[PDB]
Amino acid sequence: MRECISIHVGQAGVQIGNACWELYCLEHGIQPDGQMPSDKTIGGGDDSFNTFFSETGAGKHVPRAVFVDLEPTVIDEVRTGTYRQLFHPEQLITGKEDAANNYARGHYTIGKEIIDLVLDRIRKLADQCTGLQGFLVFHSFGGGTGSGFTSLLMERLSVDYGKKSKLEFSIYPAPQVSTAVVEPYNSILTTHTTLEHSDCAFMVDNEAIYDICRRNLDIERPTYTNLNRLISQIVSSITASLRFDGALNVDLTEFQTNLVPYPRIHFPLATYAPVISAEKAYHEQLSVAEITNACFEPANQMVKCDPRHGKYMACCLLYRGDVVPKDVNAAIATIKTKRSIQFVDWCPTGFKVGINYQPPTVVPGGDLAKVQRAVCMLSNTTAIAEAWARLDHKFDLMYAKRAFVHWYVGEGMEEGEFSEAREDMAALEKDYEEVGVD
Amino acid sequence: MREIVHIQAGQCGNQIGAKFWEVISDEHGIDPTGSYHGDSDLQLERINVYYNEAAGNKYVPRAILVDLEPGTMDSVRSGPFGQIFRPDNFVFGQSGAGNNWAKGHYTEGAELVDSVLDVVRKESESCDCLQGFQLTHSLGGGTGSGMGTLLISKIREEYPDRIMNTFSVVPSPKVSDTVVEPYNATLSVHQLVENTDETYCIDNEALYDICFRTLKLTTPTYGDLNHLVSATMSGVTTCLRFPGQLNADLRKLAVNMVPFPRLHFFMPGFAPLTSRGSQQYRALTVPELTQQMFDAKNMMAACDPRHGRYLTVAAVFRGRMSMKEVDEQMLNVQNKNSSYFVEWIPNNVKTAVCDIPPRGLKMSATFIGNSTAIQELFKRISEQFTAMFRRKAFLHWYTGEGMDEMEFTEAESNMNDLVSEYQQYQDAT
Amino acid sequence: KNIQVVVRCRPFNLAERKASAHSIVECDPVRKEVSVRTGGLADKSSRKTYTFDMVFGASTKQIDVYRSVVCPILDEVIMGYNCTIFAYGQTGTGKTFTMEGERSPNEEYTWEEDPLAGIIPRTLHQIFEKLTDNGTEFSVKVSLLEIYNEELFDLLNPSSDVSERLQMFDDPRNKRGVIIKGLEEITVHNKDEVYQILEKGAAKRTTAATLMNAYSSRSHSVFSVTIHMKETTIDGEELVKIGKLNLVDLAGSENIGRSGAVDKRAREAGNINQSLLTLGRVITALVERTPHVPYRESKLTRILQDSLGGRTRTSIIATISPASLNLEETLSTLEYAHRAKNILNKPEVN
Numbered sequence A: 001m002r003e004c005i006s007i008h009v010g011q012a013g014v015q016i017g018n019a020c021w022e023l024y025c026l027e028h029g030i031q032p033d034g035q036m037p038s039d040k041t042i043g044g045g046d047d048s049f050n051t052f053f054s055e056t057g058a059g060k061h062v063p064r065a066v067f068v069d070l071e072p073t074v075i076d077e078v079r080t081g082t083y084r085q086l087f088h089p090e091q092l093i094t095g096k097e098d099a100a101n102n103y104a105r106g107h108y109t110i111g112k113e114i115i116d117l118v119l120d121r122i123r124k125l126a127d128q129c130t131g132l133q134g135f136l137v138f139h140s141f142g143g144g145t146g147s148g149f150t151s152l153l154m155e156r157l158s159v160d161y162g163k164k165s166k167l168e169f170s171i172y173p174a175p176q177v178s179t180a181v182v183e184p185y186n187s188i189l190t191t192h193t194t195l196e197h198s199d200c201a202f203m204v205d206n207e208a209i210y211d212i213c214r215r216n217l218d219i220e221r222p223t224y225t226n227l228n229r230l231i232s233q234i235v236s237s238i239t240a241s242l243r244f245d246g247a248l249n250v251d252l253t254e255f256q257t258n259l260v261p262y263p264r265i266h267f268p269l270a271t272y273a274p275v276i277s278a279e280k281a282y283h284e285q286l287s288v289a290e291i292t293n294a295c296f297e298p299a300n301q302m303v304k305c306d307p308r309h310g311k312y313m314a315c316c317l318l319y320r321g322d323v324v325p326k327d328v329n330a331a332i333a334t335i336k337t338k339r340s341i342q343f344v345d346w347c348p349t350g351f352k353v354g355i356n357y358q359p360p361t362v363v364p365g366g367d368l369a370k371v372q373r374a375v376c377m378l379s380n381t382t383a384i385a386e387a388w389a390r391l392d393h394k395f396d397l398m399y400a401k402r403a404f405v406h407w408y409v410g411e412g413m414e415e416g417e418f419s420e421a422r423e424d425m426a427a428l429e430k431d432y433e434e435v436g437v438d
Numbered sequence B: 001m002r003e004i005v006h007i008q009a010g011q012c013g014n015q016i017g018a019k020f021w022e023v024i025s026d027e028h029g030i031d032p033t034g035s036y037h038g039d040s041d042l043q044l045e046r047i048n049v050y051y052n053e054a055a056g057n058k059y060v061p062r063a064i065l066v067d068l069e070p071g072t073m074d075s076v077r078s079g080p081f082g083q084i085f086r087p088d089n090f091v092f093g094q095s096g097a098g099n100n101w102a103k104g105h106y107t108e109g110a111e112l113v114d115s116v117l118d119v120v121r122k123e124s125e126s127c128d129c130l131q132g133f134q135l136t137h138s139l140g141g142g143t144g145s146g147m148g149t150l151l152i153s154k155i156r157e158e159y160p161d162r163i164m165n166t167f168s169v170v171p172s173p174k175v176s177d178t179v180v181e182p183y184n185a186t187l188s189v190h191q192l193v194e195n196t197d198e199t200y201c202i203d204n205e206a207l208y209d210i211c212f213r214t215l216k217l218t219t220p221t222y223g224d225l226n227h228l229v230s231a232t233m234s235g236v237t238t239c240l241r242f243p244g245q246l247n248a249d250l251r252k253l254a255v256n257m258v259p260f261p262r263l264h265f266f267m268p269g270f271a272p273l274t275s276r277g278s279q280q281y282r283a284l285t286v287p288e289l290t291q292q293m294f295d296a297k298n299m300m301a302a303c304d305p306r307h308g309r310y311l312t313v314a315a316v317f318r319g320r321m322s323m324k325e326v327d328e329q330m331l332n333v334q335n336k337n338s339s340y341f342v343e344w345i346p347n348n349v350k351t352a353v354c355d356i357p358p359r360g361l362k363m364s365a366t367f368i369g370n371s372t373a374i375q376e377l378f379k380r381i382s383e384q385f386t387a388m389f390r391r392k393a394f395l396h397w398y399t400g401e402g403m404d405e406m407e408f409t410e411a412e413s414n415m416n417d418l419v420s421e422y423q424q425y426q427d428a429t
Numbered sequence C: 001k002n003i004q005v006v007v008r009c010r011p012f013n014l015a016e017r018k019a020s021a022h023s024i025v026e027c028d029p030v031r032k033e034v035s036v037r038t039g040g041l042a043d044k045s046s047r048k049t050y051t052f053d054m055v056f057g058a059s060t061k062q063i064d065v066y067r068s069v070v071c072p073i074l075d076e077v078i079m080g081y082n083c084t085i086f087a088y089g090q091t092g093t094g095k096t097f098t099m100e101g102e103r104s105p106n107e108e109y110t111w112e113e114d115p116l117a118g119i120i121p122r123t124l125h126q127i128f129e130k131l132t133d134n135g136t137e138f139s140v141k142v143s144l145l146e147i148y149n150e151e152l153f154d155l156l157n158p159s160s161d162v163s164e165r166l167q168m169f170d171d172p173r174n175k176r177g178v179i180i181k182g183l184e185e186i187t188v189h190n191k192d193e194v195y196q197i198l199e200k201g202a203a204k205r206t207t208a209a210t211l212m213n214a215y216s217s218r219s220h221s222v223f224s225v226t227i228h229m230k231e232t233t234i235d236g237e238e239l240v241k242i243g244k245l246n247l248v249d250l251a252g253s254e255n256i257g258r259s260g261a262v263d264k265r266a267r268e269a270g271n272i273n274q275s276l277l278t279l280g281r282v283i284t285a286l287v288e289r290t291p292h293v294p295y296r297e298s299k300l301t302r303i304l305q306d307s308l309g310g311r312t313r314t315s316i317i318a319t320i321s322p323a324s325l326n327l328e329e330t331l332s333t334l335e336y337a338h339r340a341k342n343i344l345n346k347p348e349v350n
């Protein structure tokens, strides 16, 4: 079957990959040995299993994932992780090149080295798969490299893939604060190029997720990683649901395609709900209704937003497991009340709502108490736009500053191209806003 | 790998460098045995990258010592891990600078170069590319700087990959016995600024204040002062060397900190800094350290941090970092000064955290970004120079050096231009 | 003072032809403006338009501008008013091409002779006659600036070696700005001598090779002609003036793949972009003016300060390559030209 192995760029991206992979690993229940303490999965590795990782050493479930370590540090991370142990060293690839990176510089220089290696790996995997619609990969915006990889990588892969698009994951700084100036530098250039290539984009609010975890855990820190775990969990959940058999299973791409009537919003927003504190679970089990309320409430949604403030051209929430009747019943009413939701002009139809046959699953080792339902929602969010505006504001300021010309110059990347990217981003955002308004 | 050998120039460079080596070696924690104190293999690996292995997995330093006089070399060798360091790396020059910028520069450079190539090769062996070399010298010593400058210029030229960063103590403008001493400084300053895109200096005053309070010694202990100073420097390198949950490129950061290559100046920050008793008795809270870095007293350099603003702000984190702390940091920066953050770019400060908190106190911080005061400090320094010009001191030396008197003027002009621009920008939003 | 670029449009690029894309701008000398479609595909009709004192179509040639420019050229030089020319355009613009102008093939005409050659060559020739007419002592001390890693090489200078760096100091002769002196040049007796010498100089001079254009200098090229003039007036007062002309062929924005340039060339390119950007920076920086005096710091900027808003006087003519492709860069160019517009320079005798 089709198998997607994520490619994670940047320390964060890799870290995410580690978490996500590990989370998968936990789900697999297969030891780092690669032989699962569990019995062989049904159908050997499941289609999902194969999809995430091609199965080799059959009778043993050994995940295969491609990681690039621009920094040797990543390699250490990879090696440190159990997954690497399962992974044949072939699977792991480390760039000789340093990250280094200047954001502009890194992607071009690094990408070339990676691409050849990755492509081979990809092709083999593709060969392994009956066919690969596309790859879902995680990249870090903040790192120059991470952002850089996506742009360069995406195009090539897109070409190879042809019509079938790839799903892209990105790291989106919360508009509130940016990790570094550099990231927003990456953002516009990466985003504009990437967006066209990518069918969709995944947006995460680094701060927001941290905040969300922060509230429930009621520990802001430590740990960041814990926050990461949730992020891994949420991402894992959505994929997991698709992976899991469903009475109705929709491919994510199809769903996202459904989500946006227009390519204009390539990237659905990602949300997780309900968020549940462990303690809350202790107090009581979450009700379906509570789930419903939680999902809607902006705190739950990964990005903090005012639902009025944001507009949802379309909002859908994929649910893991089985959607309860309740959940479903409750939903229409919610949608109904919610002014905030926007409309498409044309037709009211074209959506799908969708349930997975498999019962709700909880990711093992979940820091938080398990939630009966973990859900994601794809929608258009103001926050991304606002973040865009915020980035734009900074960017324009940067433009006025003409600061960090040198970094780009070192890349040899055009300032004009950069400005163009900014313009394009503005165009995209403006167009997106324009389309967003009915 | 990409280990960078540190080269010291000038009398100060030599003296500091020895401490630097000691600090670094201490950081390595590699005994003369060559066993690795650090449990982590990787940490050992980094050290291993840093220093070639003597048998017993000893690590031998890669660096060149500047020999103002051969005694200094003797000193280091005499000093601990004399065995650890191997004299082959050592370069010798009895003459030393000769306290002639030109003379020392010219004479030393030839000697240095050969060692330089050899040492460079070793590093190249270690890692194909190195980010760049950081050399410590005394800016104030004209000769010390001058000797250093040549290597730095050449090296950077040799490898664009490497970025030249220098540490030199600035004579504090606060006191000058005579104009002439700063005269050396001005020459060094002019050369240095051109030489390195980014340069780092510590004010003498900063040393004086820090040393004086801490030591309470009438006169600063060179070793003691060097120890503290080295430690802070060690922290930055250590942080970069050591893995972090998020790691930031030192170079990338360096590029980041200055909006442009133009601003050589960087403002170091070390922490925790407290009185000896204070530190021992109590441990700072994480946010406390952050605040501490803000405070002038904590920062090695002396300034009125409130008065000064940061064109760019950055923070480095060690130990576990709170997400909240980050927010606190962001908030605090805004709180303390609007000027603190650049108007141009919001939330300039970005921090990277080491995975493992530094040896000693888990929490460590460095100060990033530059302050108005330092920039003023430069301006102040030039002030001495002008007086020096009025003196036309070192007229004889200048003649002997063959260095242009006009060159001095040029240095003043150039420094003036840069300082003016810097100050103007710094003043400017 | 400073002049906004007169546009000479490069004929529709063969490479552009390879694209077979229409130029976003339609090169219409008639317009004396060019616009790229802002609408673009979305709106071919809609276009952002840029206007210059003149804009020229592909049909327009460097010569066409060149003759016009050519006359005024002498005046600046004769005075000793420093003249500089910069051409603004994308790489492969013919920024260099126009700037050089074309020598008639097989050097049927020398550079100066060729109307084909750009303004400079004719003006140089004219200067030859002019000097003759003046009867003043004219000598041209030549220095070559080929900039690699901000290193200047005097291939042009008759010495094999590159001329030494001129000292960066306000030349006391020059009222304002920073002046470079101590330059070692070998003067040539005559402009005709210049013609022959230049031929020699050209051989000496090299540009970083560019795949995109062998013609294009990968590095920013800086050709400087210094003219020492001494005459005795009707009054009989003996007056000594020095004129200087900087003809600069900056590299356009390049991407390595497009360039096909060597990595080192790319390194040059990074400088290349940096320089222009820095220069871009100057107008935006320009405004504060006090004190942290924002000017001198870069070498290029340093020359620049003299160049515009400086003792030396320069004028700007831009030639563009029809390719839309460097839209951002071209836009940057166009905007930059406007940027230049903000600050004008006052001509001065060297």
Ligand SMILES: Nc1nc2c(ncn2[C@@H]2O[C@H](COP(=O)(O)CP(=O)(O)OP(=O)(O)O)[C@@H](O)[C@H]2O)c(=O)[nH]1
Pocket: B010, B011, B012, B013, B015, B016, B068, B097, B098, B099, B100, B137, B138, B140, B141, B142, B143, B144, B145, B169, B171, B181, B204, B207, B222, B226
């Ligand atoms: N912060 C420090 N400043 C120092 C130290 N040693 C000297 N200095 C200062 O540096 C200046 C003297 O320069 P050097 O130590 O480099 C003497 P150098 O070898 O460069 O030349 P000579 O005069 O020919 O010996 C002067 O301003 C001193 O106050 C030190 O260990 N730390």
Ligand SMILES: Nc1nc2c(ncn2[C@@H]2O[C@H](COP(=O)(O)OP(=O)(O)OP(=O)(O)O)[C@@H](O)[C@H]2O)c(=O)[nH]1
Pocket: A009, A010, A011, A012, A013, A014, A015, A016, A099, A100, A101, A140, A141, A142, A143, A144, A145, A146, A147, A171, A173, A179, A180, A183, A204, A206, A224, A225, A228, A231, B246, B247, B248, B249, B252
């Ligand atoms: N999703 C996610 N993002 C993270 C995490 N930790 C840090 N980030 C973000 O990732 C960005 C930094 O990118 P990195 O991937 O670490 O860096 P890089 O791409 O390897 O590049 P350099 O480190 O600069 O060489 C910042 O915006 C951080 O906020 C994490 O656990 N998860």
Ligand SMILES: Nc1ncnc2c1ncn2[C@@H]1O[C@H](COP(=O)(O)OP(=O)(O)NP(=O)(O)O)[C@@H](O)[C@H]1O
Pocket: C010, C011, C061, C062, C090, C091, C092, C093, C094, C095, C096, C097, C098, C212, C213, C214, C215, C216, C217, C218, C249, C250, C251, C252, C253, C254
């Ligand atoms: N007016 C023109 N007629 C015919 N060919 C032209 C003309 N202008 C430019 N070219 C050609 O385009 C290629 C030149 O690019 P030029 O060499 O014109 O680029 P450039 O401006 O010097 N690029 P760059 O050095 O990167 O700033 C040359 O080989 C020329 O023959």
Ligand SMILES: [Mg+2]
Pocket: A010, A011, A012, A071, A099, A143, B247
């Ligand atoms: Mg990284």
Ligand SMILES: [Mg+2]
Pocket: C096, C215, C216, C217, C218, C249, C250, C251
């Ligand atoms: Mg050219």
